[PDB]
Structure 1
Amino acid sequence: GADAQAIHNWLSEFQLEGYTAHFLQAGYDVPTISRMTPEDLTAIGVTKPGHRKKIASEIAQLSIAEWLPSYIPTDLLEWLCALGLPQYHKQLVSSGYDSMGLVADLTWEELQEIGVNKLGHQKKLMLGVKRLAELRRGLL
């Protein structure tokens, strides 16, 4: 099972499961499927036009923002969402930490007056910051 189950469910919603194995063999998972084109479907063997047409249409309705499967937060809100901390966004922005590049240099001391007061939230965040800086340094 796993993403097999997720795909098979999705496909089942319109009786086109049975194509499940196609997506698996090609190493697709739901979030990636969401970004397929028709040519992509053709390429993985969805060749019958009736079905390709349908599945494509069904894919344009698909949800999934956006940093899945990759797990690379491009922007601050995304990042705070992964970390499960979105309630702090507006505080951060009011205090001038409004981008990835900027949060990367957030420091422990700014923590009050920004108003993250729960200590597990402080720790979670500061760990994220730490790793984030580490990752940037990782480019040079």
Structure 2
Amino acid sequence: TREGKSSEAVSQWLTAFQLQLYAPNFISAGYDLPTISRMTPEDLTAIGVTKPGHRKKIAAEISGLSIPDWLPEHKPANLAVWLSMIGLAQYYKVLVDNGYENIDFITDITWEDLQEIGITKLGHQKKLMLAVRKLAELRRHHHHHH
């Protein structure tokens, strides 16, 4: 019921500004509030939010979301631990079987790479990619701390 608690929370959020009609769009794509807080308008369009007034309303509400930090702030010890912190433990096997078996390799993965190997849910793709860019920034700053 983590996924159940999460989806209830996505519905209650939408309901409070009367756009609960998109609940299935977000939930079927595996969006949770944390990932939703980082959506762009194109991400809304990709889940079927195409009417400009709805898309702009949602965009305005997302900018107002205040939710606690959830991205890890360090390069974790391994893939398993990293997936577990971000709530995506279920993709471990498919990631490993496809050649993304350690944190270093996962840092270079792209949206297109996910699509190819069967991680097709847009919300999960978004969350993975937000986490991956956090890793890439850590890696990019690592030798530049003086």
Structure 2-normalised TM-score? 0.46
Question: So what's the TM-score if we normalise by structure 1?
Answer: 0.48
Give the greater-gyration-radius structure (CA): 1
